[PDB]
Amino acid sequence: RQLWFASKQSLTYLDGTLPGDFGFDPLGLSDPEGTGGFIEPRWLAYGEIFNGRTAMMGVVGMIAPEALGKVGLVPPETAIPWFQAGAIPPAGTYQYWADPYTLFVFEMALIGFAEHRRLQDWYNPGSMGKQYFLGLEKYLGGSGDPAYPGGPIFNPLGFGTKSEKEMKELKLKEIKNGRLAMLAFLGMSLQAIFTGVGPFQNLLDHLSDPVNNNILTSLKFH
Amino acid sequence: MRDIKTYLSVAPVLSTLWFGALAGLLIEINRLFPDALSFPFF
Amino acid sequence: YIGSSTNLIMVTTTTLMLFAGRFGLAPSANRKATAGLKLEARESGLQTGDPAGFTLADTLACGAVGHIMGVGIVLGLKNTGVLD
Amino acid sequence: EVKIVVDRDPVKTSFEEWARPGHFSRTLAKGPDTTTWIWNLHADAHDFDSHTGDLEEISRKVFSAHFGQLSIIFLWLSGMYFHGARFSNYEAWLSDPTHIGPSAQVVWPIVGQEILNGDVGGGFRGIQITSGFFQLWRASGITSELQLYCTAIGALVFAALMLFAGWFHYHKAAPKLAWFQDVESMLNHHLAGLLGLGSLSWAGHQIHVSLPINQFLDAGVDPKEIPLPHEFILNRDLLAQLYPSFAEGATPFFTLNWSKYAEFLTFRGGLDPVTGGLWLTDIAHHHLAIAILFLIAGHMYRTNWGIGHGLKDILEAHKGPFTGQGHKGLYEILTTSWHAQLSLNLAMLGSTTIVVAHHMYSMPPYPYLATDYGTQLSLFTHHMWIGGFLIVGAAAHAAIFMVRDYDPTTRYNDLLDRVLRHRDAIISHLNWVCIFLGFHSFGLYIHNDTMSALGRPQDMFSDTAIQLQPIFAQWVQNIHATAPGVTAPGATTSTSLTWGGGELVAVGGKVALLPIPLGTADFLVHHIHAFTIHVTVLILLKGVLFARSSRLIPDKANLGFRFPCDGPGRGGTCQVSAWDHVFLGLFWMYNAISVVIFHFSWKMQSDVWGTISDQGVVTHITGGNFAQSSITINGWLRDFLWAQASQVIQSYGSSLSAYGLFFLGAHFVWAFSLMFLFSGRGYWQELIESIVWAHNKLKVAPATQPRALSIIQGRAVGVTHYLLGGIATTWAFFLARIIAVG
């Protein structure tokens, strides 16, 4: 428990239940005097896991296309900053294999399917392996805890061989990489809101010229 | 369900709907017979 | 534009405020002042790395007050140019 | 310390109760043996504190009720914005607002009321409005019906959301005591969070949307090709074209050389001749400075951390020699009795509403507002009425607290104890002051009227006769007109124009504001106001101080808050409950507000409002006869009450004809009130008895045994009808007169 900016209302409930408790919570949210719905410590660990994972995937993906465009062979047809890809209309757009809006509602419906089923599992664990699902039924029981589902659909290669220690390592790795990807995503987006040129080009910049130091300018522009 | 039925049978709401229907009937008659002063049928 | 009036004023005010905190010259997180004197330090329960018990609140409150007193003592700049 | 503790699912959302009325009251739930049951049912619905004995449940109930109220308010706002969108001429009004009457309500052509849709100009027909929304919608740069439409939609969404939140917080996740009773964090937030950030975000919406579009409209452009708001923030070059400084991003702010922004944040003061309104730069600077002030204020009290005060640690220190122990323990009183808080907040809210009413007319914030006469007048008088009602409610609930939840054994105090220990002195001296003011402020009018009707004008009270001069008011006005010279250099003119110095602001051949002189008539009217206010205070303060126990009835409190009397014994004991004290004070508050609003109307239409000639000669709407005809009651009849009641009485067969009709019904109810206020009960009981006989003779006697209203309910219905009649009369009078002439 490497104490970085802790408090006592943190230690009221942060007693070391989350894998690798570092003790950093000044505010003391999940005090268990009255358990707030969705403020449950279980729900908090669940949320940090899910958010960090999504942030890992996002920091890989948003940066992938243009970056690869640099000295790679993904065409310049998509050499566009993630914040200019089209998600931000005041930045850019693109002609796709559908129209914008219906595409968005369609992907929303799909992600909704997935996350609704996951939440229903959260309420009643294991309870997805009962109803007809056109197959897939004998897999979605999970590994008990909705935090960690397991299953050969989500455990292909096979790790944590005969172990909980290996799972503890792999998993610390999980929390650390999630937090790092969170930081990197937030930084890319803040540069984008204040710089206006794109992350990978910002690396192109900060490889040679040290004098950049654009906190000195603090120039706020689109 | 039956509770909401007995509640709906409480005089305020019944009276409001009855009066609304009556007023609608009257205003529709007035629309279809403007100014209707006399009894010009017999 | 570094080291000028604004810089020197802000830095000296904030550093003297933080020193008044950390040395016992400010009524910070674990010190409540009475009508008169100040040295009535009592605990809140916010143990942090600081050797004198300085949480992440007093080290922010003292900073806010230092910046406010700085802005106030400087934007009375009626003798060093109304525009800088 | 302080946490998020709540409880789960006390009461289930089951319709089991809706079919059983009066489930809350044990007696009410039994059944209506008579007809007074259905009065007593409504009469005690919201009476939460008589339904339990613990503050947790009533606190939960009021938490849900606040959500109900907010849902109703949001629905009202949505209806307003909708009717502005789909049924107004708002675009035509924006085209040129000088001589186009704001109309926002049309009527269906069914029963001859087509005449209601009178001529309002701009190719429209509709009932003219005076709510004054249009000045706001032009301040916020709405300038498009799509905006009104989507705003109404969002308001409906928020209304449904609040209703949900209500249902959920009462039924599913009920808050607990240590949450409610924790006022430190509530003050902390509401100071810093709600008000401050509110004004800050509004300053945002003004500097980034309103200011440019308003400046463009003042330059004069059809709002069709006026650039959309978001196209003023996305592409910077527009604002760059407007304000050079504004094209410098954020360096001049962070680097402490704020003077660069001087263009759009300034301290000009005065009004803007292009629209008579306020310089939006000024109001933006105001809202922003206020935001910063509330934010720095919000950080007072210790909540969870080690810094900050405690509302218990502040009172007990104050303890003076005369009073003794000071405010010790008062913190517990104002945390253990809702009615106390309701009274305090209602008093402060009424006072704030009154001061808003005042500050409105003398400093028109909106643009093209000080030239739509009826709007200004109606707004002012509405705010005045709301303030009066809030104050009376404050006094009533203070009395209720005094009766029920006050007790020295555990909710002790040494300040209120002293106050009550010498109540007689307070009431006596206030009574004598009331007599003194009554005499020397009304007998003056009587003397003046008499010495007028006796052909002795040179023995009158006026400027042309024995003279009374309001010297202090003119002194203050001189100071306010010479203050921007030395004391407040950063300003440009006086804070407003009504101060006795400067020029006049006139737009579209009509004047909006100019200096205001005070004559002896103003002295007299001010003393009338002071007297009537003192008498209302006397009534209500006597009620509160004597709600516990009087020297007439020794144990009044035991008899409860609201009871009719204590029998005709000891020479008669009618109207001794504090409830009846409030019943009395209501009429006097009505009278105070009525005379105040009459004075305002006459003074404005006789010294400020009116038209301006091409050369610059002013001919006020009424001719400026105030200082010579406000000093005789017979004058008030002749010059103001009779004369300016023309436009309402010839109003038949015109657009304004509705304002005519009410002018009678308003009076009628007004009559009707007397029937309840004068009679008693036993007479009506015997009459009802004979009627029950007449029916029973025909096998029609209803089991819901008829009963003449109880005494207290009789007084209540009487006072309600009377207030309704009076306020509706003055309402019709005002609207008809001002909207016809002006």
Ligand SMILES: CC1=C(/C=C/C(C)=C/C=C/C(C)=C/C=C/C=C(C)/C=C/C=C(C)/C=C/C2=C(C)CCCC2(C)C)C(C)(C)CCC1
């Ligand atoms: C020695 C040492 C140390 C220390 C250091 C230091 C000294 C630091 C500093 C720090 C700091 C230095 C902090 C600060 C803070 C500050 C703040 C936090 C501020 C804030 C501000 C603000 C928020 C502002 C506001 C405003 C505005 C915005 C406008 C209006 C006005 C005013 C002013 C109000 C350490 C710990 C490392 C370790 C041990 C050793």
